[PDB]
Design an enzyme around this catalytic site. Structure first.
Site, PDB file in Angstrom:
ATOM      1  N   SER A  48       1.790   3.343  16.983  1.00 51.10           N
ATOM      2  CA  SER A  48       2.691   2.784  15.973  1.00 51.10           C
ATOM      3  C   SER A  48       3.811   3.729  15.581  1.00 51.10           C
ATOM      4  CB  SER A  48       1.955   2.499  14.671  1.00 51.10           C
ATOM      5  OG  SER A  48       0.929   1.501  14.757  1.00 51.10           O
ATOM      6  N   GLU A 147       0.387  -4.707  21.852  1.00 53.38           N
ATOM      7  CA  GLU A 147       0.010  -4.413  23.232  1.00 53.38           C
ATOM      8  C   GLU A 147       0.354  -2.985  23.641  1.00 53.38           C
ATOM      9  OE1 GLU A 147       1.880  -7.173  22.385  1.00 53.38           O
ATOM     10  OE2 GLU A 147       0.151  -8.508  22.279  1.00 53.38           O
TER      11      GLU A 147
HETATM   12  C1  LIG Z   1      -1.083  -0.536  16.367  1.00 50.44           C
HETATM   13  C2  LIG Z   1      -1.055  -0.493  14.863  1.00 50.44           C
HETATM   14  O1  LIG Z   1      -1.878  -1.482  14.345  1.00 50.44           O
HETATM   15  C3  LIG Z   1      -1.406   0.929  14.330  1.00 50.44           C
HETATM   16  C4  LIG Z   1      -0.406   1.907  14.977  1.00 50.44           C
HETATM   17  O2  LIG Z   1      -0.602   2.951  15.494  1.00 50.44           O
HETATM   18  C5  LIG Z   1      -1.263   1.000  12.887  1.00 50.44           C
HETATM   19  N1  LIG Z   1      -0.597   2.289  12.448  1.00 50.44           N
HETATM   20  C6  LIG Z   1      -1.551   3.181  12.126  1.00 50.44           C
HETATM   21  C7  LIG Z   1      -1.127   4.528  11.614  1.00 50.44           C
HETATM   22  O3  LIG Z   1      -1.890   5.522  11.722  1.00 50.44           O
HETATM   23  O4  LIG Z   1       0.029   4.585  11.139  1.00 50.44           O
HETATM   24  C8  LIG Z   1      -2.767   2.447  11.764  1.00 50.44           C
HETATM   25  S1  LIG Z   1      -4.273   3.305  11.307  1.00 50.44           S
HETATM   26  C9  LIG Z   1      -4.570   2.531   9.623  1.00 50.44           C
HETATM   27  C10 LIG Z   1      -3.374   3.002   8.604  1.00 50.44           C
HETATM   28  N2  LIG Z   1      -3.908   3.972   7.877  1.00 50.44           N
HETATM   29  C11 LIG Z   1      -5.400   3.633   7.731  1.00 50.44           C
HETATM   30  C12 LIG Z   1      -6.142   4.843   7.526  1.00 50.44           C
HETATM   31  O5  LIG Z   1      -5.680   5.923   7.741  1.00 50.44           O
HETATM   32  N3  LIG Z   1      -7.496   4.778   7.040  1.00 50.44           N
HETATM   33  C13 LIG Z   1      -8.105   3.488   6.757  1.00 50.44           C
HETATM   34  C14 LIG Z   1      -8.248   6.005   6.833  1.00 50.44           C
HETATM   35  C15 LIG Z   1      -5.729   2.908   9.084  1.00 50.44           C
HETATM   36  C16 LIG Z   1      -2.630   1.092  12.040  1.00 50.44           C
HETATM   37  C17 LIG Z   1      -3.866   0.461  12.754  1.00 50.44           C
END
Ligand SMILES: C[C@@H](O)[C@@H](C=O)[C@@H]1NC(C(=O)O)=C(S[C@@H]2CN[C@H](C(=O)N(C)C)C2)[C@@H]1C
Length: 270
Positions: A48, A147
């Site tokens: 992301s 994707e």
């Molecule tokens: C493909 C996308 O869905 C992801 C991209 O990499 C999202 N972006 C990230 C990110 O790290 O920025 C989270 S992780 C999520 C965002 N922060 C939370 C976190 O850190 N937790 C729950 C501890 C979990 C998405 C899935």
């Protein structure tokens, strides 16, 4: 007064061995122009983390299209991607281009990312074209928001290098490729990111200011963060930290990203 590069390399190699994966970093002191890299020209999945550059692409377009940031986008009956915490609440209202850009960067909203890619930036190809236009010949976006996270070892789709990420962040934050209004807006968006508390932000004293964007692919232990860091009374530092693991089923490590960031930042002896 900075630490010998081989000391920093030696520390990162020990951290890699503890982690069980690969750590790639690049850092730029924007005042002295001193730099440090380790695996800096190896490719890693963006996950992301591309969304910070997507927001920059939107601002670049707005610099030539008066009022673009205020344009309202509605998406009634659209199937929203997973991890769309802002866009899934604003279907009845719509969202402005500015709000979509802030949401994609600060909450990693996939729906906002794909809306901006579809409606403004011209898909993965248009995102890549924007990066080429600022002299980044390394970045590539090949797939749409969900994707692009497969993170398969050896697959160069949807990758960049730590050096290219850091160099592009430096250009966008402090160079000429965006106007003053646009730089200020981009930096304010990065400063308000909400997903980075356990990564680069966890590596610096609490009175330093950070703007960052994270990525967490969810497979192959693959995760990353890049940032601008403002130490007290010191020129900003630009830093990119990218990680991966060989095993599909491994989890990423926030702590390893924070620890790598700490090692690199300490090496500048600020
Ligand atoms: C493909 C996308 O869905 C992801 C991209 O990499 C999202 N972006 C990230 C990110 O790290 O920025 C989270 S992780 C999520 C965002 N922060 C939370 C976190 O850190 N937790 C729950 C501890 C979990 C998405 C899935």
């Amino acid at each position: 007064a900075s630490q010998p590069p081989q000391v920093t390399v030696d520390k990162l190699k020990r951290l890699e061995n503890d982690f069980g994966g690969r750590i790639g970093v690049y850092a730029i002191d924007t005042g002295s122009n001193k730099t440090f890299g380790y695996r800096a020209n190896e490719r890693f999945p963006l996950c992301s983390s591309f969304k910070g550059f997507l927001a920059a692409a939107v601002l670049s377009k707005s610099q030539q299209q008066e009022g673009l940031l205020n344009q309202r986008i509605r998406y009634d009956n659209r199937v929203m991607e997973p991890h769309s915490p802002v866009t899934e609440k604003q279907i009845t209202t719509g969202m402005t281009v500015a709000e979509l850009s802030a949401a994609t960067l600060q909450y990693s909203d996939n729906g906002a990312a794909n809306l901006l890619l579809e409606k403004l930036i011209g898909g993965p190809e248009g995102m890549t074209s924007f990066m080429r236009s600022i002299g980044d010949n390394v970045f590539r976006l090949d797939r749409w928001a969900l994707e692009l996270n497969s993170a398969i070892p050896g697959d160069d789709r949807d990758t960049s290098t730590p050096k290219a990420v850091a160099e592009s962040m430096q250009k966008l934050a402090f160079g000429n490729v965006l106007g003053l209004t646009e730089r200020h807006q981009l930096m304010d968006w990065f400063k308000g990111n909400t997903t980075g508390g356990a990564r680069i932000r966890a590596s610096v004293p609490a009175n330093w200011v950070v703007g960052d964007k994270t990525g967490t692919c969810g497979v192959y232990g693959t995760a990353n963060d890049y940032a601008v860091i403002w130490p007290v009374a010191h020129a900003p530092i630009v830093l990119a930290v990218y990680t991966s693991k060989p095993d599909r089923n491994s989890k990423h490590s926030d702590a390893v990203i924070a620890d790598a960031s700490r090692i690199v930042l300490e090496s500048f002896n600020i």
